[PDB]
Design an enzyme around this catalytic site. Structure first.
Site, PDB file in Angstrom:
ATOM      1  N   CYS A 222       0.836  -1.193   0.000  1.00 44.52           N
ATOM      2  CA  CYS A 222       0.000   0.000   0.000  1.00 44.52           C
ATOM      3  C   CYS A 222       0.874   1.246   0.000  1.00 44.52           C
ATOM      4  O   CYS A 222       1.831   1.341   0.776  1.00 44.52           O
ATOM      5  CB  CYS A 222      -0.935   0.004   1.214  1.00 44.52           C
ATOM      6  SG  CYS A 222      -1.797  -1.570   1.493  1.00 44.52           S
ATOM      7  N   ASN A 434      -6.404   3.595   1.745  1.00 44.91           N
ATOM      8  CA  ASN A 434      -5.669   2.951   0.664  1.00 44.91           C
ATOM      9  C   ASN A 434      -6.623   2.357  -0.377  1.00 44.91           C
ATOM     10  O   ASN A 434      -7.804   2.726  -0.439  1.00 44.91           O
ATOM     11  CB  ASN A 434      -4.735   1.895   1.254  1.00 44.91           C
ATOM     12  CG  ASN A 434      -5.485   0.701   1.806  1.00 44.91           C
ATOM     13  OD1 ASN A 434      -6.551   0.843   2.401  1.00 44.91           O
ATOM     14  ND2 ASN A 434      -4.936  -0.488   1.599  1.00 44.91           N
ATOM     15  N   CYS A 436      -7.824  -0.757  -0.615  1.00 49.80           N
ATOM     16  CA  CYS A 436      -8.822  -1.663  -0.066  1.00 49.80           C
ATOM     17  C   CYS A 436      -9.338  -1.214   1.293  1.00 49.80           C
ATOM     18  O   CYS A 436      -9.953  -2.014   2.007  1.00 49.80           O
ATOM     19  CB  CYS A 436      -8.247  -3.075   0.015  1.00 49.80           C
ATOM     20  SG  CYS A 436      -7.702  -3.678  -1.591  1.00 49.80           S
ATOM     21  N   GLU A 438      -8.232  -0.558   4.267  1.00 53.08           N
ATOM     22  CA  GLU A 438      -7.788  -1.080   5.551  1.00 53.08           C
ATOM     23  C   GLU A 438      -6.611  -0.308   6.132  1.00 53.08           C
ATOM     24  O   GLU A 438      -6.297  -0.488   7.316  1.00 53.08           O
ATOM     25  CB  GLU A 438      -7.425  -2.571   5.431  1.00 53.08           C
ATOM     26  CG  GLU A 438      -6.027  -2.880   4.912  1.00 53.08           C
ATOM     27  CD  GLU A 438      -5.955  -2.952   3.394  1.00 53.08           C
ATOM     28  OE1 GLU A 438      -6.780  -2.297   2.721  1.00 53.08           O
ATOM     29  OE2 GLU A 438      -5.083  -3.688   2.876  1.00 53.08           O
ATOM     30  N   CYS A 459       2.870   0.850   3.705  1.00 51.65           N
ATOM     31  CA  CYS A 459       2.471  -0.151   4.684  1.00 51.65           C
ATOM     32  C   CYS A 459       2.807  -1.545   4.181  1.00 51.65           C
ATOM     33  O   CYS A 459       2.430  -1.921   3.066  1.00 51.65           O
ATOM     34  CB  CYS A 459       0.979  -0.053   5.005  1.00 51.65           C
ATOM     35  SG  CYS A 459       0.566  -0.816   6.587  1.00 51.65           S
ATOM     36  N   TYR A 727     -15.741  -1.181   2.466  1.00 49.20           N
ATOM     37  CA  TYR A 727     -15.112  -1.577   1.213  1.00 49.20           C
ATOM     38  C   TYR A 727     -16.166  -1.960   0.179  1.00 49.20           C
ATOM     39  O   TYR A 727     -17.100  -1.191  -0.072  1.00 49.20           O
ATOM     40  CB  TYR A 727     -14.138  -2.732   1.472  1.00 49.20           C
ATOM     41  CG  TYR A 727     -13.219  -3.089   0.324  1.00 49.20           C
ATOM     42  CD1 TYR A 727     -12.800  -2.133  -0.588  1.00 49.20           C
ATOM     43  CD2 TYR A 727     -12.777  -4.394   0.155  1.00 49.20           C
ATOM     44  CE1 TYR A 727     -11.964  -2.471  -1.638  1.00 49.20           C
ATOM     45  CE2 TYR A 727     -11.944  -4.740  -0.886  1.00 49.20           C
ATOM     46  CZ  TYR A 727     -11.541  -3.776  -1.779  1.00 49.20           C
ATOM     47  OH  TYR A 727     -10.713  -4.128  -2.816  1.00 49.20           O
ATOM     48  N   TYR A 728     -16.028  -3.145  -0.413  1.00 48.12           N
ATOM     49  CA  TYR A 728     -16.943  -3.612  -1.449  1.00 48.12           C
ATOM     50  C   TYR A 728     -18.385  -3.599  -0.959  1.00 48.12           C
ATOM     51  O   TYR A 728     -18.666  -3.816   0.225  1.00 48.12           O
ATOM     52  CB  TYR A 728     -16.594  -5.043  -1.861  1.00 48.12           C
ATOM     53  CG  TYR A 728     -15.415  -5.233  -2.788  1.00 48.12           C
ATOM     54  CD1 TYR A 728     -15.015  -4.239  -3.668  1.00 48.12           C
ATOM     55  CD2 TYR A 728     -14.703  -6.429  -2.782  1.00 48.12           C
ATOM     56  CE1 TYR A 728     -13.936  -4.436  -4.518  1.00 48.12           C
ATOM     57  CE2 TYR A 728     -13.626  -6.631  -3.620  1.00 48.12           C
ATOM     58  CZ  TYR A 728     -13.247  -5.635  -4.486  1.00 48.12           C
ATOM     59  OH  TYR A 728     -12.174  -5.844  -5.320  1.00 48.12           O
TER      60      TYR A 728
HETATM   61  N1  CDP Z   1      -5.324  -6.511  -7.173  1.00 49.95           N
HETATM   62  C1  CDP Z   1      -4.687  -5.997  -6.094  1.00 49.95           C
HETATM   63  C2  CDP Z   1      -4.860  -6.573  -4.841  1.00 49.95           C
HETATM   64  C3  CDP Z   1      -4.200  -6.038  -3.741  1.00 49.95           C
HETATM   65  N2  CDP Z   1      -3.404  -4.971  -3.888  1.00 49.95           N
HETATM   66  C4  CDP Z   1      -2.712  -4.403  -2.727  1.00 49.95           C
HETATM   67  O1  CDP Z   1      -2.705  -5.323  -1.629  1.00 49.95           O
HETATM   68  C5  CDP Z   1      -3.280  -4.723  -0.461  1.00 49.95           C
HETATM   69  C6  CDP Z   1      -4.113  -5.743   0.302  1.00 49.95           C
HETATM   70  O2  CDP Z   1      -4.798  -6.553  -0.646  1.00 49.95           O
HETATM   71  P1  CDP Z   1      -4.879  -8.143  -0.431  1.00 49.95           P
HETATM   72  O3  CDP Z   1      -4.285  -8.480   0.917  1.00 49.95           O
HETATM   73  O4  CDP Z   1      -6.282  -8.571  -0.791  1.00 49.95           O
HETATM   74  O5  CDP Z   1      -3.876  -8.622  -1.603  1.00 49.95           O
HETATM   75  P2  CDP Z   1      -2.923  -9.919  -1.488  1.00 49.95           P
HETATM   76  O6  CDP Z   1      -1.909  -9.541  -0.432  1.00 49.95           O
HETATM   77  O7  CDP Z   1      -3.827 -11.059  -1.092  1.00 49.95           O
HETATM   78  O8  CDP Z   1      -2.365 -10.030  -2.888  1.00 49.95           O
HETATM   79  C7  CDP Z   1      -4.142  -3.588  -0.973  1.00 49.95           C
HETATM   80  O9  CDP Z   1      -4.195  -2.514  -0.034  1.00 49.95           O
HETATM   81  C8  CDP Z   1      -3.468  -3.170  -2.262  1.00 49.95           C
HETATM   82  O10 CDP Z   1      -2.543  -2.114  -1.996  1.00 49.95           O
HETATM   83  C9  CDP Z   1      -3.239  -4.397  -5.167  1.00 49.95           C
HETATM   84  O11 CDP Z   1      -2.498  -3.401  -5.318  1.00 49.95           O
HETATM   85  N3  CDP Z   1      -3.882  -4.920  -6.236  1.00 49.95           N
END
Ligand code: CDP
Ligand code: DTP
Ligand code: DAT
Ligand code: MG
Ligand code: MG
Lengths: 734, 35
Positions: A222, A434, A436, A438, A459, A727-728
């Protein structure tokens, strides 16, 4: 009579016994699977010279499509075939080579960072090879292996050539993170951290999984950039987006300061074109590059609800309208505070202002809620200030209408982000989130790409597997390993933007969340909707935060607190158990079980190594490695369909045979109140925020259409329990 | 039963051996809500 093409290029007679044997091996010990069914459903068409690798990939898809509720063990049959396939691709055989021999070959090709051979001797590499248990590749599910081969394993994004296997990935993430540790304890931390991630006690994010051991060192998921009201700042913001998107990062942009369309420039020398032309510039910046070659770049843009252009900004994602007034490929977070909600409850109006025409209103909107109400009501009376009146009901209806259609219009409660945060709003306020929703960290806008005064918030993430612990006291050891690994990561990685290094080294912000929370509730016989998990969630997330803070506190004794610890509320001796929203006492009465007073005094004395520690990310991709239910979300079905590079993936819930009755599926819930109550309880202990979802089934409502009344009531219920972000919004497709 | 219990090794053989938004809002209901 017919010929196949082996992996080495040679040809030999077709022999179906070879296919029988490899399938017999993969189905050993599995229940209710059929070698015969896999071969016939492959529909494999033999031609003279057929590649043996195309044959194998075909039967992997066939076995993968047989994953069902009646035959869940196909998740392991397809994985074993896929693991076997990945071994041949990387090594030419099934048995992996020695750890040292692999690292040497990979550093010469430029696929690993050469620092691995400088910080570790050959005697140490051979000693880490005894830590590795390559049989742990036989514990992945099919979805896990497809994420490895698609995203995480070091590979050529032009050739498609795989270079490593799963256990080398794990052991080298441990090696790199503790590479700068004293040799008195280095290999001990390397072994324990390898055990923690290879047995699925700790979950690691996509950039750490795919990156930590490669020459390019950027592993923070992030990046939060704040944009000022100037062309120098817009250019600086845009340049930071391009740089961090190209290096595995997801972006959060704060463009609420940009003045409204029609505002004067230099006293009237020019007509301000509005936010939308600058938002379009941010969008092409995000889309200009891939996210480190793994996936596409994404970003969320933040603006206050009272912005003068809010009615034009809320509709940027719907597909109707011209391209001139549409910015569809970015998500948006609308920033709201208590005063805005009150105007809705009292049926009054909301006045829209340009942030350039209201002195101090923007800064107060986050830091000082009383000063905001003073300035806001004052500026409503002033008739010399350019303004626009909208009924609060109509503005909230427009926002939730666009939130329900696209699912990507987010809400941030900025007062909650500052009254219940680890930062002092007078010194380092939280003004954005950010991608998502969080992460909630302080930022200061930049005036140049290399501005030393601006602050970009990074982060780094990780997650505890709630399905892998048998006692909450196991978290004490896991928090030590996770915090030490992520803190050593901040010094290990590089920083393409100076303003980003400033925030990282100053605050050392971490975001550690959880996975398998739904599976965790099933093992305790609790559910999301009925409130039976409220007390369990309180006891669970108290332990998570306590052992996290204790781990970062012990690290502060060892290496000193973070330079800007004085800017935290922790420095003033204030804990999250003090600033949480007091309405949570009406939905959970579980008493605190750990010695928070001893920690409060220890934090006063020794401080914290990290300004933040906890944040519940969605972990859409990373949670699939351990075959866990992602984050805190309930699974959509016993067999979930998830997206991937090759196509569809079927993921079975953990322990389906024994716990299928215990799970509460996503669409089996009456509403959102029970889930939002759990989110509020979690938020009592979480430093930053949570990627909280809202879900709606149109068929559960009269005449099959979701009422705006329920959308707003759930939105107000989220605020009532101190939920910082939303979020979503998932709407069912049936 | 003389043999060990097992599932059907050829399950395919059974085929052959048989046969939007409601815009309404109530402000009075919303004001009865405590933040
Ligand atoms: N398609 C995505 C998914 C996550 N992310 C980054 O990952 C962070 C947390 O997403 P997540 O934990 O679902 O992603 P993963 O760690 O599972 O790939 C988000 O705040 C985004 O900054 C992204 O840049 N693009
Ligand atoms: N030619 C232009 N067309 C449209 N918008 C502009 C133009 N120039 C500047 N802006 C916008 C971008 C910023 O949001 C805002 C201020 O821009 P900035 O770079 O600070 O200009 P400035 O310092 O010369 O004028 P000001 O005195 O208005 O700040 O106006
Ligand atoms: N002569 C042959 N005729 C048909 N299929 C074959 C074959 N030899 C191997 N296969 C199948 C079995 C495996 O599922 C798949 C790939 O197996 P492999 O052992 O990786 O290939 P190879 O034997 O060419 O090294 O191809
Ligand atoms: Mg072979
Ligand atoms: Mg200016």
């Amino acid at each position: 009579n017919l010929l196949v093409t082996k992996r080495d290029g040679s040809t030999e007679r077709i022999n179906l016994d070879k296919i029988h044997r490899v399938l017999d091996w993969a189905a050993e010990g599995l229940h209710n699977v059929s070698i015969s069914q896999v071969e016939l459903r492959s529909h494999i068409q033999f031609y003279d010279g057929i590649k043996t690798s195309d044959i194998h990939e075909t039967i992997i898809k066939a076995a993968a499509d047989l994953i069902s509720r009646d035959a869940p063990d196909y998740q392991y049959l397809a994985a074993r075939l896929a693991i076997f396939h990945l071994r041949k691709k990387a090594y030419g055989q099934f048995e992996p080579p020695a750890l040292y021999d692999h690292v040497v070959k990979m550093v010469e090709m430029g696929k690993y960072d050469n620092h691995l051979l400088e910080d570790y001797t050959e005697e140490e590499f051979k000693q880490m090879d005894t830590f590795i248990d390559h049989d742990r590749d036989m514990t992945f599910s099919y979805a896990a292996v497809k994420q490895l081969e698609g995203k995480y394993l070091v590979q050529n994004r032009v050739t498609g050539e795989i270079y490593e296997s799963a256990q080398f990935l794990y052991i080298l993430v441990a090696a790199c993170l503790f590479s700068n540790y004293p040799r008195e304890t280095r290999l001990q931390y390397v072994k324990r951290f390898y055990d923690a991630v290879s047995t699925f006690k700790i979950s690691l994010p996509t950039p750490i999984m795919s990156g930590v051991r490669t020459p390019t060192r950027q592993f923070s998921s992030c990046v939060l950039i704040e944009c000022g009201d100037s062309l120098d700042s817009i250019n600086a913001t845009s340049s930071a987006i391009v740089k961090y998107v190209s290096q595995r990062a997801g972006i959060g942009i704060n463009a609420g300061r940009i003045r409204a369309l029609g505002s004067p420039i230099r006293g009237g020398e020019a007509f301000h074109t509005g936010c939308i032309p600058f938002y379009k510039h941010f969008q092409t910046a995000v889309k200009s590059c891939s996210q480190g070659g793994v996936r596409g770049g994404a970003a969320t843009l933040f603006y206050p609800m009272w912005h003068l252009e809010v009615e034009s900004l809320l509709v940027l994602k719907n597909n109707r309208g011209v391209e001139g007034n549409r910015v569809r490929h970015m998500d948006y977070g609308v920033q709201i505070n208590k005063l805005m909600y009150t105007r809705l409850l009292k049926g009054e109006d909301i006045t829209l202002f340009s942030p350039s025409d209201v002195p101090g209103l923007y800064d107060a909107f986050f830091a000082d809620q009383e000063e905001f109400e003073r300035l806001y009501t004052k500026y409503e009376k002033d008739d010399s200030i350019r303004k626009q009146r909208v009924k609060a009901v109509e503005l909230f209806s427009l926002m939730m209408q666009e939130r329900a259609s696209t699912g990507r219009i987010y809400i941030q409660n900025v007062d909650h982000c500052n009254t219940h945060s680890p930062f002092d709003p007078a010194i380092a306020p939280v003004r954005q989130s950010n991608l998502c929703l969080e992460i909630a960290l302080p930022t200061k806008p930049l005036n140049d790409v290399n501005d030393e005064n601006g602050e970009i918030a990074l982060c780094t993430l990780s997650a505890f597997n709630l399905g892998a612990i048998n006692n909450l006291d196991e978290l004490e050891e896991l928090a030590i390993l996770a915090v030490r690994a992520l803190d050593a990561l901040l010094d290990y990685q590089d920083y393409p933007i100076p303003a980003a290094k400033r925030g990282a080294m100053g605050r050392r912000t971490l975001g550690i969340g959880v996975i398998n929370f739904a599976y965790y509730l099933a093992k305790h016989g609790k559910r999301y909707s009925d409130g039976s998990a409220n007390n369990l969630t309180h006891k669970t997330f108290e332990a998570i935060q306590y052992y996290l803070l204790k781990a970062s506190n012990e690290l502060a004794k060892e290496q000193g607190a973070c330079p800007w610890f004085n800017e935290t509320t922790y420095a003033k001796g204030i804990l999250p158990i003090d600033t949480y929203k007091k309405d949570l006492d009406t939905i959970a009465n579980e008493p605190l079980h750990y010695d928070w007073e001893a920690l409060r005094e220890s934090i006063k004395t020794h401080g914290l190594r990290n300004s933040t520690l906890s944040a519940l990310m969605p972990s859409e991709t990373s949670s699939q490695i351990s075959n866990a239910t992602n984050g805190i979300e309930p699974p959509r079905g016993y067999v979930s369909i998830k997206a991937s590079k090759d196509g569809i993936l079927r993921q079975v819930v953990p322990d389906y045979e024994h716990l299928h009755d215990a799970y509460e599926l996503l669409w089996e819930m009456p509403g959102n109140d029970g889930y939002l109550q759990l989110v509020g309880i979690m938020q009592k202990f979480i430093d930053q925020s949570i990627s909280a979802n809202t879900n709606y089934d149109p068929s559960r409502f009269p005449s099959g259409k979701v009422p705006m009344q329920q959308l707003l009531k759930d939105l107000l219920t989220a605020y009532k329990f101190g939920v910082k972000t939303l979020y979503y919004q998932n709407t069912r497709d049936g | 039963l003389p043999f060990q219990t097992r599932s059907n090794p050829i399950p395919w053989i059974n085929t052959w051996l048989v046969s939007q938004i409601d815009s309404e809002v109530d402000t009075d209901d919303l004001s009865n809500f405590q933040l």
